[PDB]
Amino acid sequence: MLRRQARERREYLYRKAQELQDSQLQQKQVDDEYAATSGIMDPRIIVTTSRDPSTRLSQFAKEIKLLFPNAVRLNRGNYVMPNLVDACKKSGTTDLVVLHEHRGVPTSLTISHFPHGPTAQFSLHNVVMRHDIINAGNQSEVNPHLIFDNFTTALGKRVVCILKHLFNAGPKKDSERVITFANRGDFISVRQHVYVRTREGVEIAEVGPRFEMRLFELRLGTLENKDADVEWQLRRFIRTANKKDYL
Amino acid sequence: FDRTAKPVPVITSEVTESLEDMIRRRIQDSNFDDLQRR
């Protein structure tokens, strides 16, 4: 049983390596992980947190749940990462999202794609939760339209592919909800608006939450595997770190 | 002195206004980067 997982990792690492060579040869489609199910089977998403979450992180975890139409929130009391990952694989979960905080302020967000990765780690900035809005009302939970703006590099395409597949395929053309990911110097701004088509343009109203995410690590494996090969990591101490852009 | 890393951006009203201009133009042209059935 562990044998099948051990074998499939070797095939997965081999497939990513081969796909890298063909891409590099082409340098001289949808990623292999998402290729099989892209546009076929809708995602199954679990939103959890670190152990003993504060009330705010729980509120934020509930908001990330409402962002994705097929997301379910799970309480992480005493659950261990190998058991959390193994349980998610048993239950048909496609993506696992784990949130971290510091004194009730969301700090980090990690996305792990099952069964074999990738695992992407973000850092949250300028987080403004819908609970911080008075008389906000209830959200609309339709399959939203997506906007991915200013993603140019191959890594940017990799990040778009990871975030794109957290939503269902084929939103209705008249769906009034739009989720935008706007890259501005490697700081992805995430907004959620509901729009009305007027007789001379479009008027949008922001729903929330607001936050900026910046990818700082991307590994070829699930979040439990700390030995997983690093696909990309953000160098902080190189002398071009303060102006270099990647996405 | 120099700083080692990029400063975290500040969301001012101009940044919002420019961002919502990108969003409104995209909706106007129906230019969405959303997954489709295969």
Binding site: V128, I133, I134, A205, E206 | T16
Partner: peptide, 27 residues
């Protein structure tokens, strides 16, 4: 456009840092 964006329904105090930044720009 201004009523329907509470982040700039009304937001709780402290969610935006616009007032501080504009003062720095003037300085």
């Amino acid at each position: 456009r201004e009523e329907f964006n509470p982040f700039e329904a009304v937001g709780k105090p402290g969610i935006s840092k616009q007032i501080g930044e504009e003062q720095r720009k003037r300085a």
